[PDB]
Amino acid sequence: AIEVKLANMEAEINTLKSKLELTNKLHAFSMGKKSGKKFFVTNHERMPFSKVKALCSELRGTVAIPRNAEENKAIQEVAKTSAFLGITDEVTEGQFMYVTGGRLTYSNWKKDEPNDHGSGEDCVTIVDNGLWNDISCQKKKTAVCEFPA
Amino acid sequence: AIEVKLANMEAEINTLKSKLELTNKLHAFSMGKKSGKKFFVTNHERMPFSKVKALCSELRGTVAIPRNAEENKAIQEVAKTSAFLGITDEVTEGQFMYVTGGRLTYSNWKKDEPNDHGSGEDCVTIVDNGLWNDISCQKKKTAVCEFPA
Amino acid sequence: AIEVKLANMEAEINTLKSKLELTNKLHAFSMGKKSGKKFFVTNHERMPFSKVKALCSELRGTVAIPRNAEENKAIQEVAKTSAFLGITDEVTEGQFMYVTGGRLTYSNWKKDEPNDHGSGEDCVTIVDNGLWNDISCQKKKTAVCEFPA
Ligand SMILES: CO[C@@H]1O[C@H](CO)[C@@H](O[C@@H]2O[C@H](CO)[C@H](O)[C@H](O[C@]3(C(=O)O)C[C@H](O)[C@@H](NC(C)=O)[C@H]([C@H](O)[C@H](O)CO)O3)[C@H]2O)[C@H](O[C@@H]2O[C@@H](C)[C@@H](O)[C@@H](O)[C@@H]2O)[C@H]1NC(C)=O
Ligand SMILES: CO[C@@H]1O[C@H](CO)[C@@H](O[C@@H]2O[C@H](CO)[C@H](O)[C@H](O[C@]3(C(=O)O)C[C@H](O)[C@@H](NC(C)=O)[C@H]([C@H](O)[C@H](O)CO)O3)[C@H]2O)[C@H](O[C@@H]2O[C@@H](C)[C@@H](O)[C@@H](O)[C@@H]2O)[C@H]1NC(C)=O
Ligand SMILES: CC(=O)N[C@@H]1[C@@H](O[C@@H]2O[C@@H](C)[C@@H](O)[C@@H](O)[C@@H]2O)[C@H](O[C@@H]2O[C@H](CO)[C@H](O)[C@H](O[C@]3(C(=O)O)C[C@H](O)[C@@H](NC(C)=O)[C@H]([C@H](O)[C@H](O)CO)O3)[C@H]2O)[C@@H](CO)O[C@H]1O
Ligand SMILES: [Ca+2]
Ligand SMILES: [Ca+2]
Ligand SMILES: [Ca+2]
Ligand SMILES: [Ca+2]
Ligand SMILES: [Ca+2]
Ligand SMILES: [Ca+2]
Ligand SMILES: [Ca+2]
Ligand SMILES: [Ca+2]
Ligand SMILES: [Ca+2]
Ligand SMILES: [Ca+2]
Ligand SMILES: [Cl-]
Ligand SMILES: [Cl-]
Ligand SMILES: [Cl-]
């Protein structure tokens, strides 16, 4: 009994792992994930940058980061309203870095941005026209998480 | 060896349990669940109150209940049409109680309601405007379930 | 004690099986699944018929098939644009069959369709008004899958 029951349970676990993987595939599909492309998801809730970071991390994702014009538009369509991007110059003023590390490979700043206006702006929002503007990380913007391709 | 196989399998199970919980979190988020707020969801099907109660229970949820104006609006936008609420006055006419227990606190009655019209109306529906109207439980209204915050 | 650990593992696995099924049920409900009815899902991605079939099959579903006017309207609403249906006359020109087997019964062909235009058209697409047209399986249309009732 012992060894047989153990061997079976191993098959039971393997079966459940496959089922859960398929469930995740179906869930990603319904969330709009295109084949071989990373995808963006939002609950349409507005919150400060720190809360967005924590939220996406818990979901094992990251704050949405556009690496090109296509992805920039994609985020825009998902968010619908101004949302935070996973880009800040919190570590060193003037040096915008990805929250995942590294300097920007792609940008789409509005004229005269980023300006660190007034009291300061260390976060980035993608406006309702695709251009970027740095804003206060304390302002409440739409939470948009990104998941791997 | 057996003890090692067993320990290793317990580890796989814990990981799988954590992974499914993550799947649940991401799903709720994609469906609009806000931070620290109850999750309201509908399949847009209209049915009698008894079926709504049965359906939500099968999903391990309950018929949506607005505890305040904020939740009332949240349910209003998920339903979009007239939907049953988890409130009835079947025990003592005029005394509305939540299906999960307790006396009705927050209410948002429409003018001249509740009127227990005709043969009697013991269920409650949140109509398009967000206001409430008492209606026969046998009538078919949208099914909206609620899950914990 | 080995046997005690084994029995707990079985209870852990069975609890996990039930929870995964609850997750699947809740996901179907959120996707608009009506009681005792099959449901449809789409990621809004356009691809050739062979790709759609492969995708749905991988998710344990099939390319959407309207068996009546109700299902047709439902698919039309999910798709939003022209999408492939799980119906083709690839095996024998002129005789449309469901990808899962059997000859086509209910149909909703547009005026003067099907016409196997030019070199040929063996796949079927549901257009914006809900009517059908036969087209090349090589063309890219929205991927819409159906899952069991
Ligand atoms: C004066 O106050 C208002 O009076 C009207 C009419 O009595 C109420 O609306 C009726 O509500 C009853 C609920 O028991 C029914 O829904 C009536 O509707 C039908 C019906 O019985 O199903 C619709 C049928 O199509 C109709 N038959 C035909 C052949 O047309 C049928 C007959 O006319 C009826 O049997 C004759 O007695 O009537 C409604 O007309 C108002 O109640 C409010 O609105 C309704 C629609 C419900 O939502 C109630 O919960 C509301 O209180 C009532 N309003 C107030 C403020 O008192
Ligand atoms: C009178 O009957 C009607 O005839 C027209 C013209 O042939 C059909 O429309 C064509 O259908 C074919 C189906 O294979 C293609 O969709 C044609 O479209 C293209 C194409 O071949 O992809 C579009 C290309 O952009 C175009 N090329 C350029 C450079 O512009 C190309 C060329 O014109 C063509 O290849 C030259 O050889 O045409 C359609 O024009 C009608 O078919 C029906 O409507 C179309 C749009 C499809 O939905 C078909 O499945 C429909 O049956 C046809 N209608 C009927 C009722 O018989
Ligand atoms: C190109 C440029 O430099 N433009 C300047 C404006 O900044 C641009 O637009 C604003 C809206 C932001 O998007 C910037 O990122 C962008 O560069 C600038 O506008 C002012 O910017 C500051 C940024 O620190 C701020 O957004 C001002 O709005 C608020 C504020 O957040 O501080 C909005 C608050 O709701 C409001 N408070 C209340 C209680 O209503 C405050 C409040 O009025 C001030 O704190 C009072 O001191 O303002 C926004 O106006 C503009 C300002 O002069 O200058 C442009 O050159
Ligand atoms: Ca700074
Ligand atoms: Ca700055
Ligand atoms: Ca700025
Ligand atoms: Ca009564
Ligand atoms: Ca009553
Ligand atoms: Ca009434
Ligand atoms: Ca053919
Ligand atoms: Ca012809
Ligand atoms: Ca053909
Ligand atoms: Ca045709
Ligand atoms: Cl800041
Ligand atoms: Cl009643
Ligand atoms: Cl073809």
XYZ file of C-alpha atoms and ligand atoms in Angstrom:
630
model
C 0.000 0.000 0.000
C 2.415 2.739 1.219
C 4.597 2.915 -1.920
C 1.663 2.471 -4.269
C -0.316 5.241 -2.536
C 2.766 7.445 -2.671
C 3.363 6.820 -6.397
C -0.283 7.586 -7.113
C -0.225 10.835 -5.152
C 2.812 11.870 -7.127
C 0.742 11.398 -10.307
C -2.145 13.257 -8.647
C 0.151 16.234 -7.924
C 1.553 16.182 -11.457
C -1.988 16.138 -12.826
C -2.953 19.128 -10.671
C 0.104 21.062 -11.775
C -0.920 20.587 -15.425
C -4.510 21.559 -14.671
C -3.476 24.730 -12.866
C -1.162 25.643 -15.741
C -4.086 25.253 -18.157
C -6.323 27.326 -15.884
C -3.664 30.081 -15.977
C -3.517 29.829 -19.778
C -7.295 30.210 -20.061
C -7.238 33.100 -17.583
C -4.498 34.913 -19.533
C -6.439 34.347 -22.763
C -9.616 35.879 -21.311
C -7.527 38.762 -19.953
C -6.553 39.506 -23.547
C -3.044 38.084 -23.723
C -1.983 37.745 -27.370
C 0.248 34.784 -28.245
C 3.901 35.329 -27.345
C 3.208 38.880 -26.115
C 3.403 40.300 -22.600
C 0.080 41.500 -21.244
C -1.265 44.364 -19.165
C -4.104 44.118 -16.614
C -5.906 46.678 -14.436
C -8.712 46.698 -11.859
C -9.340 50.372 -12.724
C -8.438 51.495 -9.216
C -6.442 54.719 -8.718
C -3.726 54.664 -6.047
C -0.220 56.038 -5.214
C 2.816 54.509 -6.950
C 4.038 52.569 -3.898
C 0.694 50.802 -3.643
C 0.787 49.936 -7.342
C 4.268 48.423 -7.003
C 3.264 46.340 -4.000
C 0.050 45.219 -5.721
C 1.711 44.086 -8.935
C 4.501 42.350 -7.013
C 1.978 40.365 -4.991
C 0.407 39.238 -8.295
C 3.924 38.274 -9.427
C 3.883 40.963 -12.093
C 5.411 44.444 -12.402
C 4.111 47.979 -12.941
C 3.410 48.344 -16.683
C 6.455 49.382 -18.731
C 6.213 50.313 -22.432
C 9.375 49.293 -24.335
C 8.063 50.623 -27.659
C 5.199 52.610 -29.247
C 3.071 49.478 -29.611
C 3.304 48.626 -25.896
C 2.785 52.287 -25.055
C -0.533 52.266 -26.921
C -1.455 48.869 -25.455
C -1.108 50.214 -21.909
C -3.160 53.248 -22.867
C -6.028 51.071 -24.142
C -5.969 48.906 -21.009
C -5.747 51.746 -18.469
C -8.196 54.119 -20.236
C -7.218 56.947 -17.851
C -3.765 58.185 -16.776
C -1.825 55.345 -15.162
C 1.577 54.919 -13.514
C 4.410 53.329 -15.518
C 7.167 51.251 -13.898
C 9.598 54.124 -14.397
C 10.937 56.611 -11.766
C 14.004 58.777 -11.033
C 13.669 58.210 -7.287
C 17.194 56.868 -6.831
C 18.942 59.759 -8.557
C 17.024 62.879 -9.594
C 17.044 63.253 -13.369
C 17.949 59.611 -14.033
C 14.800 57.742 -14.985
C 15.253 54.015 -14.440
C 12.956 51.011 -14.836
C 11.599 49.684 -11.540
C 13.087 46.379 -12.722
C 16.477 48.097 -13.059
C 18.280 49.748 -15.955
C 18.057 52.978 -17.938
C 15.244 53.705 -20.397
C 15.620 52.095 -23.831
C 12.431 53.792 -25.058
C 10.712 57.030 -24.033
C 7.886 59.251 -25.260
C 8.113 62.411 -23.149
C 5.773 65.341 -23.750
C 7.548 68.604 -24.659
C 9.552 70.014 -21.733
C 9.070 66.833 -19.675
C 10.295 65.429 -17.374
C 10.487 68.632 -15.319
C 10.318 67.548 -11.627
C 7.753 70.311 -11.164
C 7.460 72.267 -7.935
C 7.751 70.106 -4.849
C 8.981 67.300 -7.085
C 7.866 64.615 -9.539
C 9.584 61.224 -9.501
C 6.954 59.059 -11.180
C 5.669 58.754 -14.752
C 2.139 58.697 -16.146
C 1.032 58.006 -19.723
C -1.591 60.654 -20.487
C -4.747 60.204 -22.572
C -2.714 60.889 -25.746
C 0.314 58.593 -25.363
C 2.878 61.228 -24.346
C 4.670 60.925 -21.021
C 4.770 63.345 -18.123
C 6.523 62.893 -14.807
C 4.239 63.384 -11.803
C 4.178 63.040 -8.047
C 4.333 59.414 -6.894
C 1.807 60.381 -4.214
C -0.955 61.201 -6.721
C -3.550 58.458 -7.269
C -3.339 56.941 -10.727
C -4.721 53.779 -12.341
C -2.922 50.565 -11.359
C -1.764 48.603 -14.422
C 0.316 45.439 -13.976
C 2.434 43.684 -16.580
C 2.984 39.954 -17.019
C 5.596 38.065 -19.144
C 5.135 37.035 -22.775
C 13.829 7.223 0.990
C 10.053 7.058 1.590
C 10.262 9.806 4.216
C 12.232 11.930 1.767
C 9.744 11.374 -1.079
C 6.919 12.306 1.273
C 8.610 15.488 2.501
C 9.362 16.487 -1.080
C 5.716 15.957 -2.043
C 4.447 18.056 0.855
C 6.685 20.861 -0.469
C 5.184 20.588 -3.980
C 1.680 20.752 -2.472
C 2.427 23.948 -0.509
C 3.773 25.581 -3.672
C 0.725 24.486 -5.657
C -1.600 25.903 -2.963
C 0.229 29.239 -3.041
C 0.103 29.229 -6.834
C -3.698 28.721 -6.912
C -4.203 31.503 -4.381
C -2.227 33.743 -6.740
C -4.523 32.684 -9.605
C -7.520 33.709 -7.488
C -5.955 37.110 -6.691
C -5.118 37.880 -10.294
C -8.594 36.857 -11.427
C -10.382 39.075 -8.862
C -8.103 41.965 -9.850
C -8.853 41.554 -13.597
C -12.562 41.563 -12.744
C -12.264 44.899 -10.973
C -11.819 43.970 -7.293
C -10.548 47.067 -5.493
C -8.036 46.977 -2.642
C -9.650 46.086 0.673
C -13.127 46.049 -0.880
C -15.536 43.195 -1.496
C -15.506 41.562 -4.908
C -18.849 41.851 -6.772
C -19.384 39.816 -9.953
C -22.210 38.850 -12.328
C -22.774 36.509 -15.298
C -25.634 38.811 -16.425
C -28.237 36.074 -16.091
C -31.719 36.861 -14.763
C -33.339 34.309 -12.449
C -35.630 34.026 -9.380
C -34.122 34.904 -5.986
C -33.867 31.264 -4.875
C -31.665 30.478 -7.876
C -29.448 33.519 -7.247
C -28.902 32.321 -3.669
C -28.137 28.791 -4.859
C -25.750 29.983 -7.570
C -23.670 32.276 -5.343
C -23.461 29.532 -2.694
C -22.134 27.066 -5.246
C -19.339 29.574 -5.933
C -18.759 29.917 -2.187
C -20.039 33.484 -2.231
C -23.292 35.250 -1.278
C -25.941 37.464 -2.938
C -24.485 40.984 -3.155
C -25.277 43.254 -0.214
C -24.651 47.038 -0.175
C -23.580 47.975 3.392
C -23.165 51.636 2.376
C -23.504 54.084 -0.535
C -20.054 53.195 -1.868
C -20.900 49.487 -2.128
C -24.342 50.289 -3.505
C -22.718 52.156 -6.408
C -20.152 49.368 -6.921
C -22.966 46.784 -7.287
C -24.932 49.204 -9.502
C -22.162 49.313 -12.086
C -21.489 45.556 -12.058
C -25.175 44.681 -12.527
C -26.098 47.504 -14.945
C -29.706 46.234 -14.803
C -32.182 45.457 -12.017
C -30.585 42.853 -9.771
C -31.566 41.072 -6.554
C -29.871 42.076 -3.312
C -29.263 39.747 -0.357
C -32.114 41.291 1.658
C -35.713 40.104 2.356
C -38.597 40.743 4.794
C -40.000 37.204 4.767
C -39.959 36.832 8.591
C -41.640 40.053 9.730
C -43.189 42.171 6.995
C -41.476 45.554 6.918
C -38.441 44.228 8.744
C -35.795 43.685 6.089
C -32.991 41.300 7.059
C -29.784 40.349 5.237
C -29.650 36.763 3.970
C -26.398 36.404 5.925
C -28.048 37.626 9.130
C -28.819 40.967 10.744
C -31.245 43.857 10.416
C -31.097 46.185 7.453
C -28.911 49.173 8.265
C -28.156 51.072 5.031
C -31.090 51.399 2.642
C -31.724 53.294 -0.573
C -35.451 53.040 -1.235
C -37.158 54.557 -4.240
C -40.035 56.973 -3.567
C -43.168 55.176 -2.361
C -41.196 51.979 -1.659
C -41.296 49.514 -0.057
C -45.003 48.996 -0.773
C -45.387 45.194 -0.596
C -47.550 45.624 -3.696
C -50.320 43.240 -4.687
C -49.971 39.686 -3.398
C -46.869 40.846 -1.551
C -43.240 41.577 -2.368
C -40.540 40.247 -0.054
C -37.334 40.570 -2.092
C -35.317 43.658 -2.994
C -33.819 44.799 -6.304
C -31.350 47.594 -6.937
C -32.796 49.285 -10.013
C -30.922 51.088 -12.832
C -30.761 54.398 -10.901
C -29.269 52.724 -7.830
C -32.467 53.056 -5.784
C -34.249 50.069 -4.293
C -37.674 48.555 -4.891
C -39.194 45.599 -3.088
C -40.413 42.927 -5.488
C -41.715 39.373 -5.649
C -38.917 36.860 -5.109
C -40.365 34.741 -7.911
C -39.602 37.387 -10.518
C -36.358 37.019 -12.524
C -33.615 39.560 -11.909
C -29.855 39.717 -12.525
C -27.618 37.488 -10.371
C -24.787 39.380 -8.657
C -22.512 37.583 -6.173
C -20.192 38.982 -3.522
C -16.848 37.617 -2.295
C -14.770 38.805 0.728
C -12.480 41.850 0.682
C 4.196 8.477 11.354
C 4.262 7.690 7.633
C 0.596 6.682 7.301
C -0.664 9.761 9.127
C 1.372 11.953 6.793
C 0.042 10.010 3.822
C -3.586 10.520 4.877
C -3.034 14.242 5.439
C -1.510 14.464 1.973
C -4.597 12.845 0.449
C -6.827 15.354 2.298
C -4.560 18.188 1.093
C -4.786 16.965 -2.518
C -8.571 16.515 -2.351
C -8.982 19.988 -0.835
C -6.850 21.371 -3.688
C -8.937 19.550 -6.316
C -12.111 21.130 -4.928
C -10.584 24.605 -4.739
C -9.287 24.478 -8.306
C -12.738 23.483 -9.498
C -14.253 26.380 -7.538
C -11.741 28.683 -9.250
C -12.777 27.325 -12.688
C -16.484 27.774 -11.856
C -15.968 31.367 -10.682
C -13.958 32.165 -13.800
C -16.675 30.742 -16.074
C -19.324 32.763 -14.154
C -17.304 35.989 -14.624
C -16.985 35.183 -18.351
C -20.772 35.195 -18.700
C -21.446 31.466 -18.466
C -25.184 30.948 -18.066
C -26.443 28.037 -15.987
C -26.231 24.764 -17.923
C -24.974 26.593 -21.018
C -21.581 26.509 -22.697
C -19.663 29.789 -22.692
C -17.441 31.706 -25.095
C -14.177 33.572 -24.526
C -11.873 35.565 -26.812
C -8.556 37.418 -26.434
C -9.570 39.495 -29.473
C -6.560 38.222 -31.427
C -6.826 37.638 -35.185
C -5.104 34.573 -36.618
C -5.525 31.874 -39.333
C -8.091 29.140 -38.670
C -5.449 26.482 -37.923
C -4.022 28.705 -35.153
C -7.431 29.313 -33.551
C -8.183 25.594 -33.557
C -4.811 24.795 -31.974
C -5.307 27.473 -29.313
C -8.819 26.408 -28.277
C -7.803 22.740 -28.327
C -4.877 23.547 -26.017
C -7.328 25.228 -23.615
C -9.586 22.146 -23.757
C -12.243 23.919 -25.797
C -13.072 24.310 -29.486
C -13.605 27.099 -32.008
C -17.027 28.616 -31.246
C -20.038 26.888 -32.841
C -23.497 28.564 -32.962
C -26.065 25.754 -32.630
C -28.994 28.194 -32.536
C -29.897 31.910 -32.700
C -29.242 32.381 -28.962
C -25.674 31.030 -29.165
C -25.106 32.923 -32.396
C -26.058 36.211 -30.755
C -23.875 35.320 -27.758
C -20.816 34.582 -29.953
C -21.429 37.763 -31.950
C -21.394 39.743 -28.683
C -18.195 38.098 -27.437
C -16.332 38.473 -30.752
C -17.249 42.121 -31.461
C -15.791 41.622 -34.964
C -15.693 38.871 -37.598
C -14.475 35.618 -36.064
C -13.954 32.045 -37.226
C -16.592 29.461 -36.327
C -15.888 25.774 -35.692
C -17.415 24.774 -39.047
C -15.643 23.879 -42.357
C -16.161 21.999 -45.662
C -12.472 21.037 -45.886
C -13.101 17.286 -45.856
C -15.641 17.265 -48.698
C -16.317 20.427 -50.693
C -19.866 21.597 -50.194
C -20.666 19.640 -47.022
C -20.056 21.761 -43.955
C -19.229 19.822 -40.774
C -18.534 20.850 -37.199
C -14.846 20.628 -36.263
C -15.938 18.268 -33.480
C -17.985 16.044 -35.796
C -21.318 15.938 -37.576
C -23.040 17.700 -40.435
C -24.122 21.320 -40.121
C -27.769 21.769 -39.134
C -28.605 25.281 -37.897
C -27.059 27.946 -40.147
C -27.240 31.745 -40.531
C -25.677 32.362 -43.942
C -25.786 35.817 -45.493
C -27.639 36.198 -48.784
C -25.794 34.334 -51.571
C -23.402 32.515 -49.207
C -21.700 30.067 -49.013
C -20.062 30.488 -52.432
C -16.583 28.821 -52.281
C -15.339 31.944 -54.058
C -12.531 31.758 -56.562
C -9.860 29.184 -55.766
C -11.994 28.208 -52.773
C -13.214 29.068 -49.269
C -13.500 26.235 -46.718
C -13.836 28.029 -43.366
C -16.734 30.034 -41.903
C -16.742 33.457 -40.276
C -19.519 35.159 -38.262
C -19.635 38.808 -39.290
C -20.685 41.929 -37.342
C -24.447 41.559 -38.050
C -24.295 37.929 -36.925
C -24.708 36.389 -40.381
C -22.188 33.908 -41.839
C -19.834 33.857 -44.836
C -17.421 31.142 -45.989
C -13.824 32.340 -46.357
C -10.260 31.169 -46.749
C -8.933 29.357 -43.671
C -5.659 31.234 -44.283
C -7.246 34.603 -43.523
C -6.904 36.125 -40.049
C -10.096 36.438 -38.004
C -10.814 36.840 -34.277
C -10.154 33.754 -32.129
C -13.284 32.823 -30.127
C -13.383 29.539 -28.159
C -16.343 27.758 -26.596
C -16.193 25.687 -23.437
C -18.641 22.933 -22.264
C -22.035 23.579 -20.653
C -50.519 53.009 -8.422
O -49.337 52.314 -7.967
C -48.713 51.505 -8.923
O -49.613 50.568 -9.486
C -49.033 49.759 -10.518
C -50.163 48.959 -11.136
O -50.816 48.151 -10.168
C -47.916 48.900 -9.929
O -47.349 48.074 -10.975
C -47.842 46.775 -11.103
O -47.099 45.946 -10.218
C -47.556 44.583 -10.229
C -46.780 43.863 -9.139
O -47.566 42.870 -8.518
C -47.389 43.971 -11.636
O -46.011 43.837 -11.944
C -48.090 44.816 -12.709
O -47.684 44.389 -14.037
C -48.438 43.443 -14.749
C -48.328 42.060 -14.062
O -49.170 41.745 -13.188
O -47.397 41.285 -14.381
C -47.910 43.355 -16.201
C -48.850 42.573 -17.115
O -48.399 42.685 -18.455
C -50.275 43.131 -17.002
N -51.195 42.412 -17.873
C -51.545 42.856 -19.078
C -52.515 41.959 -19.821
O -51.084 43.895 -19.562
C -50.679 43.017 -15.539
C -52.149 43.390 -15.314
O -52.393 44.701 -15.798
C -52.478 43.304 -13.821
O -52.634 41.946 -13.435
C -53.761 44.056 -13.475
O -53.938 44.046 -12.062
O -49.816 43.866 -14.735
C -47.675 46.278 -12.547
O -48.456 47.071 -13.424
C -46.851 49.811 -9.271
O -45.894 49.011 -8.536
C -44.542 49.315 -8.742
O -44.132 48.980 -10.054
C -44.301 47.584 -10.373
C -43.935 47.405 -11.833
C -43.488 46.705 -9.419
O -42.104 46.875 -9.670
C -43.785 47.048 -7.958
O -42.836 46.389 -7.129
C -43.687 48.553 -7.731
O -44.102 48.862 -6.410
C -47.538 50.772 -8.281
N -46.591 51.734 -7.739
C -46.694 52.221 -6.501
C -45.627 53.231 -6.124
O -47.576 51.862 -5.713
C -19.961 39.094 -57.524
O -19.488 38.229 -56.468
C -18.551 38.818 -55.607
O -17.292 39.006 -56.239
C -16.330 39.691 -55.417
C -15.094 39.959 -56.271
O -14.398 38.755 -56.578
C -16.036 38.850 -54.179
O -15.108 39.555 -53.331
C -13.797 39.102 -53.343
O -13.765 37.886 -52.592
C -12.449 37.316 -52.494
C -12.601 36.000 -51.753
O -11.411 35.234 -51.829
C -11.518 38.285 -51.771
O -11.997 38.499 -50.448
C -11.475 39.615 -52.536
O -10.693 40.585 -51.807
C -9.388 40.815 -52.229
C -8.518 39.560 -51.984
O -8.368 38.731 -52.914
O -7.991 39.393 -50.861
C -8.814 42.014 -51.453
C -7.472 42.468 -52.022
O -7.044 43.657 -51.364
C -7.621 42.715 -53.526
N -6.342 43.111 -54.088
C -6.017 44.378 -54.323
C -4.624 44.564 -54.899
O -6.797 45.314 -54.133
C -8.117 41.424 -54.177
C -8.177 41.535 -55.703
O -9.245 42.396 -56.082
C -8.374 40.152 -56.353
O -7.519 39.185 -55.762
C -8.063 40.208 -57.836
O -7.881 38.891 -58.325
O -9.418 41.088 -53.645
C -12.886 40.156 -52.715
O -12.839 41.309 -53.542
C -17.330 38.555 -53.419
O -17.054 37.631 -52.345
C -17.726 37.906 -51.151
O -17.222 39.084 -50.531
C -15.821 39.015 -50.201
C -15.439 40.349 -49.570
C -15.558 37.816 -49.280
O -16.194 38.055 -48.031
C -16.107 36.524 -49.900
O -15.972 35.445 -48.990
C -17.577 36.724 -50.214
O -18.115 35.558 -50.812
C -18.389 37.951 -54.351
N -19.663 37.865 -53.659
C -20.592 36.961 -53.949
C -21.850 37.066 -53.106
O -20.440 36.105 -54.814
C 5.391 72.578 -18.782
C 5.310 73.036 -17.331
O 6.311 73.234 -16.639
N 4.073 73.179 -16.858
C 3.799 73.615 -15.501
C 2.624 72.826 -14.901
O 3.036 71.444 -14.764
C 2.495 70.534 -15.685
O 1.113 70.311 -15.450
C 0.823 69.795 -14.136
C -0.686 69.692 -14.012
C 1.537 68.465 -13.924
O 0.974 67.491 -14.783
C 3.033 68.600 -14.212
O 3.641 67.321 -14.168
C 3.252 69.214 -15.589
O 4.641 69.435 -15.802
C 2.282 73.398 -13.513
O 1.095 72.786 -12.964
C 1.121 72.479 -11.605
O 1.996 71.364 -11.428
C 2.091 70.959 -10.055
C 3.162 69.886 -9.968
O 3.816 69.925 -8.706
C 0.731 70.487 -9.567
O 0.295 69.375 -10.338
C -0.294 71.623 -9.667
O -1.615 71.118 -9.356
C -2.018 70.969 -8.028
C -0.973 70.170 -7.238
O -0.977 68.927 -7.324
O -0.132 70.784 -6.542
C -3.357 70.229 -7.998
C -3.892 70.147 -6.577
O -5.171 69.532 -6.581
C -3.990 71.552 -5.984
N -4.439 71.455 -4.605
C -5.714 71.572 -4.245
C -5.959 71.424 -2.754
O -6.616 71.808 -5.053
C -2.611 72.218 -6.052
C -2.626 73.626 -5.441
O -3.367 74.510 -6.269
C -1.191 74.150 -5.264
O -0.466 73.282 -4.398
C -1.197 75.567 -4.677
O 0.129 75.963 -4.352
O -2.151 72.274 -7.429
C -0.297 72.161 -11.109
O -1.083 73.341 -11.178
C 2.097 74.918 -13.566
C 1.898 75.541 -12.186
O 2.234 76.922 -12.176
O 3.266 75.531 -14.144
C 3.543 75.117 -15.475
O 4.651 75.785 -16.005
Ca 13.491 63.409 -6.768
Ca 12.172 63.796 -10.509
Ca 5.943 67.001 -15.025
Ca -44.421 39.642 3.482
Ca -42.739 42.685 2.049
Ca -42.561 47.437 -4.721
Ca -12.630 22.998 -50.760
Ca -17.998 31.549 -58.194
Ca -15.743 25.295 -49.620
Ca -17.872 33.447 -49.320
Cl 7.437 62.304 -6.318
Cl -42.335 37.838 -2.377
Cl -9.874 27.637 -47.523
